[PDB]
C-alpha cells in the first residue's frame, strides 16, 4: 500500500512536467505564428514594391 502511494507521487510528478513541456511547446508554436504573420507582411510589401519598380 505504501508503494502504491510512492508510485502515484511519481506519476503525478511526471504529469506536472508533461504540462510544463506542453506549455513550452504551445509558446513555441505561438512564436511560429508570429513569424508566419511577419513573413506574410514582408512578402506582400516586397512584391508590391518589386512590381512597382519593375512596371513603371
Distance CA 26, CA 18 (A): 12
Q: Could you tell me the smallest distance in angstroms from the CB atom of residue 44 to a copy of itself?
A: 9
Question: Whose grid coordinates read 513569424?
Answer: 35
Query: Which CA distances in Å does 31 have to 12, 28, 41?
Result: 29, 5, 16
Q: Could you tell me the smallest distance in angstroms from the CB atom of residue 9 to a copy of itself?
A: 10
Residues 8-37, interacting with a copy of itself (CB under 8 A): 8, 10-11, 14-15, 17-18, 21-22, 24-25, 27-29, 31-32, 34-36
Binding status of residue 2 toward a copy of itself by CB under 8 A: no
Amino acid at each position: 500500500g505504501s508503494e502504491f502511494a510512492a508510485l502515484t507521487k511519481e506519476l503525478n510528478a511526471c504529469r506536472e512536467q508533461l504540462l510544463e513541456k506542453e506549455e513550452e511547446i504551445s509558446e513555441l508554436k505561438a512564436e511560429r505564428n508570429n513569424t508566419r504573420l511577419l513573413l506574410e507582411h514582408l512578402e506582400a510589401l516586397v512584391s508590391r514594391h518589386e512590381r512597382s519598380l519593375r512596371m513603371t
